[PDB]
Amino acid sequence: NVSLTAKGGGHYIEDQWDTQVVEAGVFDDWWVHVEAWNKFLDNLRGINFSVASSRSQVAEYLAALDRDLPADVDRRFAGARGQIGSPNYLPAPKFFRLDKRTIAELTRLSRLTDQPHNNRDIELNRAKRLTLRDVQPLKDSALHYQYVLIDLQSARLPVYTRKTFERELALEWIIPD
Amino acid sequence: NVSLTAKGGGHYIEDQWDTQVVEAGVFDDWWVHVEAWNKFLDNLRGINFSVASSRSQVAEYLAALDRDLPADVDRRFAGARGQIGSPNYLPAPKFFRLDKRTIAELTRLSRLTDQPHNNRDIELNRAKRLTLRDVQPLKDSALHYQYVLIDLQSARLPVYTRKTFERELALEWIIPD
Amino acid sequence: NVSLTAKGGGHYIEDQWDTQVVEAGVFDDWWVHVEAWNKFLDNLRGINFSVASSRSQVAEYLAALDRDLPADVDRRFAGARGQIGSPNYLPAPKFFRLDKRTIAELTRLSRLTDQPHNNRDIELNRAKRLTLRDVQPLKDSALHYQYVLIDLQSARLPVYTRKTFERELALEWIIPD
Amino acid sequence: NVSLTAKGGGHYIEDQWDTQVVEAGVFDDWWVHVEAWNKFLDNLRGINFSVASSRSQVAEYLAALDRDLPADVDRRFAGARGQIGSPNYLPAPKFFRLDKRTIAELTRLSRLTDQPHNNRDIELNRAKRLTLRDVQPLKDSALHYQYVLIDLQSARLPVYTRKTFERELALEWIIPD
Amino acid sequence: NVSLTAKGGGHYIEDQWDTQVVEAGVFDDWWVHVEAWNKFLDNLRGINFSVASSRSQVAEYLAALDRDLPADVDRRFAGARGQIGSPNYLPAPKFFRLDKRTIAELTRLSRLTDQPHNNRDIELNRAKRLTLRDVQPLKDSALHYQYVLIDLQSARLPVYTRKTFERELALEWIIPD
Amino acid sequence: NVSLTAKGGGHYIEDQWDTQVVEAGVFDDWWVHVEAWNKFLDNLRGINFSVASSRSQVAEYLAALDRDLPADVDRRFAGARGQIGSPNYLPAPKFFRLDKRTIAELTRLSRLTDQPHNNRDIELNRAKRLTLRDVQPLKDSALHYQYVLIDLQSARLPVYTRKTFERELALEWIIPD
Amino acid sequence: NVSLTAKGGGHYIEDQWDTQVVEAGVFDDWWVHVEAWNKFLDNLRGINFSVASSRSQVAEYLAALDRDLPADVDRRFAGARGQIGSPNYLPAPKFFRLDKRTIAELTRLSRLTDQPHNNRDIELNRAKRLTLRDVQPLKDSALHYQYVLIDLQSARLPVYTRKTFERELALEWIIPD
Amino acid sequence: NVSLTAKGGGHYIEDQWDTQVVEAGVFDDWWVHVEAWNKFLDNLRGINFSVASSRSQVAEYLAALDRDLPADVDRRFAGARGQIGSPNYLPAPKFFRLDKRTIAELTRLSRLTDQPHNNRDIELNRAKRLTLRDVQPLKDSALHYQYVLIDLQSARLPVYTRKTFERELALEWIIPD
Amino acid sequence: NVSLTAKGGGHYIEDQWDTQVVEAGVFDDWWVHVEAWNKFLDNLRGINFSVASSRSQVAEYLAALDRDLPADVDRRFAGARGQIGSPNYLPAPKFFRLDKRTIAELTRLSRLTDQPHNNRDIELNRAKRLTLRDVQPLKDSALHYQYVLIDLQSARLPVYTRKTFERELALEWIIPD
Amino acid sequence: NVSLTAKGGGHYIEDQWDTQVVEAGVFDDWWVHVEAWNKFLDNLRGINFSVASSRSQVAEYLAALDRDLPADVDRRFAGARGQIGSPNYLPAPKFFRLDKRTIAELTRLSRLTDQPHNNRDIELNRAKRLTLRDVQPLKDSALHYQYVLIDLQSARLPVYTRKTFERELALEWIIPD
Amino acid sequence: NVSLTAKGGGHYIEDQWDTQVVEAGVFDDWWVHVEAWNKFLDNLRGINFSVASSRSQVAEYLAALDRDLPADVDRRFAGARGQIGSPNYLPAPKFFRLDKRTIAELTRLSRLTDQPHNNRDIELNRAKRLTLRDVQPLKDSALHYQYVLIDLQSARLPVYTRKTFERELALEWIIPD
């Protein structure tokens, strides 16, 4: 979970954090790492309808993606620590604000994926000794998938650095006394 | 159950607690931990219709989620104890007020899940020696599930800290004499 | 049965207890403990239609829930005994007044549950050597269940402490002479 | 991932990088190497509908293509280091700015490719001992493929060198003091 | 039987013991030792359906578990005797109040276990000289077991020390005159 | 059983231990050692369905895992005793708080494992002189195992040191007078 | 277990170790040696489905791989001790942070491997005196293996030296006074 | 393992090695010797599907191929030491950078090779005294092999000398003071 | 029989001995010496099913094990007499309280051992002049033995010294007047 | 029995020995000498199933292994007595704490070994004048042996010196006054 | 046993030996001499399945191989004593650290070797006056042998001199004062 920045130094004033960032309007609002989100993106490009265990994979990743908000005062929104120029830099984390509309779209995928099933035939028709099977209820889903996903990739979402997160919501870091 | 804060110190005046918080309007009203609720969220993302024991899992979690209200005078609404800055902080608990409408929605899921069944065929057609089975009564449910759940995730619910719970309902903590 | 408070000290005047609390209007009117009722609630969330012994469980709990009224003069409506502040408190019992309408709803569940049956087939078709079975008379019940229960959870019922039970019905405790 | 140029020397001023290149308008916007993209191109020319494992190949390459943006201050947009004339040159990298419209086209291919299937027949009709099979749902796809791809090759996309990337978006490299 | 504390010193007043603890509401209500109950727990985790003598073990333990209530005036509810700090302490006994509902659940296990049988075949088909046998009536039981037991472990039951048993039911110990 | 720290020195105040740690909310709640739990983990990775005596091994370990809570006043939550720097340190014990939900999951494994059986055939068909056998009722279990276990490993559980156990539940150690 | 670096010298401040590295976010998170992990990699390349004892080998290695985290204050994250240039160097250990998603993938392999079986036929059909056998339940697994493994090799995981482990999580080593 | 060049002389600056070559982007990225790789190539040209022990040969070589990266500061990327002209030269090592895509292709071969099997028939039908056998599941594999291999040979991969490895990633060798 | 400590000195008060130790709750409850019990343990490890006279050995030892309770007022629970330090010490006896459940387990062994028999054949088939014999009714017993015994060894039983036996049951020794 | 260190000097305080080492948690817990245990190890490597008298050897050694705990106050945990440097040293004893789980594993071997038998045939078929014999009930055991033993060798158990035994359980040696 | 180096001179500091080399992580970890191990290697190359006494030879050597760790302070890890150049040198001992995985592999061989048997036929069918015999249970073993051994030879294990053993684990030799 992306809370990789030291607790200490401190701190958000606690008049505004209460007011603006917690209580209403950030948290319980999702956050994924850039060049960590992309990876999420392709696990799903990227998937074969249909063999089982290749479908349960959609469900699996969304947990542990990993998804959190990094600054929890006493924390700074991750930066990250280097001087410009000298080669110990670690230049920034950039984070994605997914929106009230989309997490409920990512969700759509998670159970656009599996459908109630009659699989157990194998323990029947084939093994003690036909069926073939029906495919269609998959096919439409496999296509429904292609759209809900082609939206996901082609949907320019807001990026946020430490520089921005203090600007968009004004919070002061209050450096020691 | 989230009653993690010391009994002692005390106490809510007992003129208002009786009046406002107990008797009518909080209790018997649910409360789940943030970043503890989310986890609830994904156990359910997050589920395969249909194999048994993957359906009874919805029922199972809602008990022990865990769900309670933390301040019971003599108790303070959990805070939690640290000074800002110095790295022994434990910064806050933030709690979800689910609403008279939703607990009866979470409930919907719990028994949107299982349906009366003819499973015992296995002890018949297959084992002493076909059936296949019928799927449809599952399928619709599996889709009914996808909606009642896509509401759950995309439903911005009220968050409450110690700072807020004394403000929204005014109670005084009455520090020793 | 929630009669956990000492007999002794005494007592309700016996002019009003006769008049108001016994004779007509409380007793034979049900009472369940809070955070003891909830538990009742989830045993039933919380149940699989259909395997037997998972249905007889509804019937079983309603007896021993446990259900009684706590003050029987010479008794005080349970309080309970602690000073505020000092950590030997036991802060209150809060009790649910279920209503003439609902106990006859909880009842509905108890025998919404089982139905006359042809089970004994197992001792026939399957064991000396098919049937499958019919499910439908269960299915509707399983859904009838989901409603009579989704009312139960989402039905804000009156809570009562010692503070309230003497106020709503005025009784004096008559402390020794 | 094409970040082949030394971290060090530094650096983009950090007034404009924040403003123009990160935050909004480059990143999360794709970048493929020239004469590295072409190779991508022909893996797909270049493919046989239908044998399996010859279809999963579309999915596979798009990850690891490889795709990234090279300058992350403190980094210079790769150049690359040689003097003109003397035979240690490494003359330039030239990079493709694919567009909001196309990555969602490349995506189209990735799952224009596989479709829900009834393959498991082989473990049936043929192996324990006909079917033939149906082809048509492939055929149309195989043709749908030919168009979405004939666009890809015949779509002149913007090339960018170090010389250009500082011109199109004005950033200064700030050489030591 | 957990009556390990000296008879003597005395005594419960005998106005309340009669009233509250004996007569109605404790006794004939079960009591098992903590870290003595757990052991009970795992003898049953913890069992193989099916070989005989591995099933009669459920029956066997519940007697001698051991189960009793410790204070019988003239007795103190076991404490136990040490000063804090100095290393002859014996710090407390903590006891489980199992409930009217559960002892009738523990019972369920005891004869969920054995079933009427045709074992004597061995003295027939096999020894003077086939049968195999039927398993199914075991199998369901073995699964019925898994649930009635998974309730037992995951059922947080009330713990009681000397400190509590005098508080929950108010009794005075009456130290010599 | 992890009670490895000296009785003596003392002691938890006994106002809070009664209140918070015993009575309700820790005990009867499980505790396994880190890098002692892992070992538990792999005994189960780690197991062959099916040969007998390779299945009874699941049952066997869970007892003696070993599982207890270490501080029982008069005891300190194990630390452990060294100065920083000088090489007689023994740096800490870190302990796992498994949850009301999981011990009833670990339990699931214990009897997900064995099933009622017809083994005794060997003393028949084969030895006095076929059968083969049926495998399927194992196979599903072996797969059911793979999931209930893949949850166990991939379930980040709370770690607790002496530093934390006094913070999360506030108890004072009361050093001699 | 890779704890090869001297205890002594000391030490991590113990304000941050508690905060950041232990408690939550490293430990119970896996760590394998580079050019020690690779070896793990090929034991599994690298395996024949199916002869027994060539399948139990997957299970066997994952224990003792060997897997631990090296710095436990008072310990330094292994370095390792040499001056640059002079030929007694031992240049670094580089370690793999496997992720919450993957250890539950490595696990998948461990019991993707064995399946419930009817082997004992050999002691029957063949030895006292046919069967052949069925292969298919292996075959699919053998292919399922090929994918879960082709992910393992082609999954660029994070490498960490002493230089990095203090940077990514900021800890100070506190050299003697 | 190709680390044939003296440790000593030294050394890579350790500002860039950390930055560029280790940490992310070379290591855990494979390296095979030229005119040592070719040999690998033909062991596989070069193989008979199917006799056993002629298939396990694919698996065997990939370990010990041998595969490593040669410069580990304090090491120089192998050169190798001679003056031009005078006949003690040893002119260069040239190394292959296989890519994230291909090692997962070489892997494909390793277990494209063996399949779950019914071989043990020989100990049956033939030896105690038909079967013939089935070939097809081999045949397709033998052809699948021919393609995944005809890619391997006809895939021009990047060659790297000492001259290049310092140019492509800029590292300085820092000759004594 | 372990009554090795002088009669004399005296004595247990005879108000408590009657009350607590005799009458009900110690005696007729077994007691074996430590490092005298172990020896019992291995005589049984430790035994060959089956030759006669190697089976009657189980029966034989349990009598004379030897088993008794040592203090019979006027007796002190054996101590034993030495000063600390000076080398005439005899430091303690430590005794095992076997439980109502186990003596009936040790018993199980005693006649798990022999079974009704047809031995006398030897005086027939073999001596005046075949039979072989049947083994199976032994074999199962020999295995039944292995379990009832593997419980015995791995069952941590309570140890008791003089220091403890006066603490667990409070008795005073009453030294002369 | 490893009690090789002089009685005298003295002594463990007798407040802690009672508390911690005896009573509960060491004794009746096994202890074998290092480089004395190994020898045990190979007597069993190391054994031929099957000729009799080569099987009774497992049983025989476990008694007299030899197994005891060395310090019995008044005793010091054996050290052993030498000064460093001067060649009369006897440097340490190091001892193995086998665990509640393993002694019940070593036990397994002891009677994994012998099985009820029909040997006496020799006095029949062969000597007064065929049989051959049956082997299988041995064979499986011989293999069952190979596993329960391959655990024994590859199970890193805790080593303890005098230095450690006073640290892990804190006891003071109390040197004369 | 390779403890060939004088006791005397001394000594390992005894702060680190306790910490690092003994207690946990070397001892009970095996050690074989180079060009003494090889010899072990070929006794096993090197063996004929099957004649008896040519199989018991595997078992025999592993004891007395010989296997120990040479430095036991007060001892130096054997060196060995000569000056470079002058022809009384004895240049080094180099030792093999076999691993937790392999000693349990060498073990495999030891009882991969013998199997329960029916040999005694010779005293029957052949000598008083056919059988032939069955070979197969040997044959597979003889092949199982060939693999577990072809791993042993082709498994590059770590070599250690005095120079290395003080470097890998840092211990100081402390030369007289």
Q: Quick count: other Cβ atoms within 10 Å of Cβ E3? A: 16
Q: Is the peptide bond before C33 cis (omega within 30 degrees of 0)?
A: no
- Of J112, J51, B156, F94, nearest to G17 by C-alpha is F94
Distances (CA, A) of A44 to A39, A47, E95, H58: 9, 6, 54, 32
> Residue K67: what are its φ and ψ, rounded to 5°?
-135, 120
Burial class (CB in 10 A: 0-12, 13-18, 19+), A172: exposed
DSSP sequence for D119-166: GGGGGTTTT--------HHHHHHHHHHHHHHHHHHT--PPEE-HHHHH
Which of E95, E112, E150, E165 best probes binding to F when mutated, by most F CB atoms within 10 angstroms?
A: E150
Q: In what order do the strands lie in the sheet with J32-33?
A: J32-33, J95-96, J159-160
Those residues with Cβ within 8 angstroms of residue J63's Cβ, 6 or more apart along the chain or in another chain: I42, I45, I46
Considering only the beta carbons, identify the residue of J94, J129, J149 that sits closest to K22. J94
Helix (H, G, I), strand (E, B) or coil at H36: coil
Q: In this complex, is the C-beta atom of E20 within 8 Å of any C-beta atom belonging to chain C? A: yes
CA distance H133 to H117: 11
CA distance D77 to D91: 13
Q: Please tell me which residue of chain D has the smallest CA distance to A140.
A: D116
- Dihedral of alpha carbons B46, B47, B53, B55, sign: positive
CA distance F140 to B107: 30
CA distance H112 to C139: 49
Inter-chain CB proximity C64 and E100 less than 8 Å: yes
Inter-chain CB proximity H56 and G50 less than 8 Å: no
- Dihedral of alpha carbons E119, E124, E128, E134, sign: negative
Q: Please tell me which residue of chain G has the smallest CA distance to B90.
A: G19
CA distance F67 to F60: 13
E strands in B10-164: 32-33, 95-96, 159-160
Q: In this complex, is the C-beta atom of D87 within 8 Å of any C-beta atom belonging to chain H? A: no
**Residues making up chain I, counted from first to last:** 177
- Interhelix angle C136-153/C103-112, rounded to 10 degrees, is 160
Q: Does chain G touch chain I (at least 3 C-beta pairs within 8 Å)?
A: no
Q: Please tell me which residue of chain F has the smallest CA distance to K15.
A: F87
Helix or strand run (H / E) with residue E33: strand E32-33
Q: Quick count: other Cβ atoms within 10 Å of Cβ C118? A: 9
- Of A74, A50, A62, nearest to A173 by C-alpha is A74
* E–J interface: beta-carbon pairs under 8 A: 4
Inter-chain CB proximity B138 and A124 less than 8 Å: no
- Of F37, K122, B136, H5, nearest to J126 by C-alpha is K122
CA distance B50 to J177: 76
Helix (H, G, I), strand (E, B) or coil at K144: helix
CA distance B24 to J101: 55
Considering only the beta carbons, identify the residue of F20, F100, F169 that sits closest to B64. F100
CA distance J163 to K14: 10
Those residues with Cβ within 8 angstroms of residue K162's Cβ, 6 or more apart along the chain or in another chain: K76, K77, K78, K79, K92, K93
Chain J residues with CB under 8 Å of K116 CB are: 49-50, 135, 138-139, 141-142
Q: CA angle at residue D56 from D55 to D59, to 5 degrees? A: 115
> Residue C108: what are its φ and ψ, rounded to 5°?
-50, -50
Those residues with Cβ within 8 angstroms of residue D41's Cβ, 6 or more apart along the chain or in another chain: D152, D153
Distance from CA of E23 to the nearest CA of C (A): 13
- Of A74, A53, A46, nearest to A153 by C-alpha is A46
Chain F residues with CB under 8 Å of C88 CB are: 15
Q: In this complex, is the C-beta atom of E6 within 8 Å of any C-beta atom belonging to chain I? A: yes
Distance from CA of G78 to the nearest CA of F (A): 16
Q: In this complex, is the C-beta atom of H25 within 8 Å of any C-beta atom belonging to chain D? A: yes
CA D12 to chain centre: 25
What approach was used to elucidate this structure?
cryo-EM
Instruction: Break chain K down into helix, strand, coil percent, rounded to 5.
Output: 35, 5, 60
Q: Say what the resolution is, in angstroms.
A: 4.1
Written as six digits, the tokens of G44 are: 């599994």
Helix (H, G, I), strand (E, B) or coil at H163: helix
CA distance H165 to H12: 12
- Of C161, C171, C176, C177, nearest to C73 by C-alpha is C171
Q: Does chain I touch chain D (at least 3 C-beta pairs within 8 Å)?
A: no
CA distance E36 to E33: 5
CA distance K100 to K29: 7
Q: In this complex, is the C-beta atom of J19 within 8 Å of any C-beta atom belonging to chain F? A: yes
CA distance B68 to H27: 51
| Tokens 């006359």, residue located | C116
The answer for A19, left when phi > 0, alpha when psi is -120 to 50, beta otherwise, is alpha
Residues 34-53 of E with CB under 8 A from I: 53
Instruction: Break chain B down into helix, strand, coil percent, rounded to 5.
Output: 35, 5, 60
Q: In this complex, is the C-beta atom of A107 within 8 Å of any C-beta atom belonging to chain D? A: no
* F–G interface: beta-carbon pairs under 8 A: 111
DSSP sequence for G6-61: -B-S----SSHIIIIITTTTSTTS--EETTTHHHHHHHTTS--TTSTTSSHHHHHH
Written as six digits, the tokens of A98 are: 């997914």
Q: CA angle at residue I35 from I30 to I39, to 5 degrees? A: 85
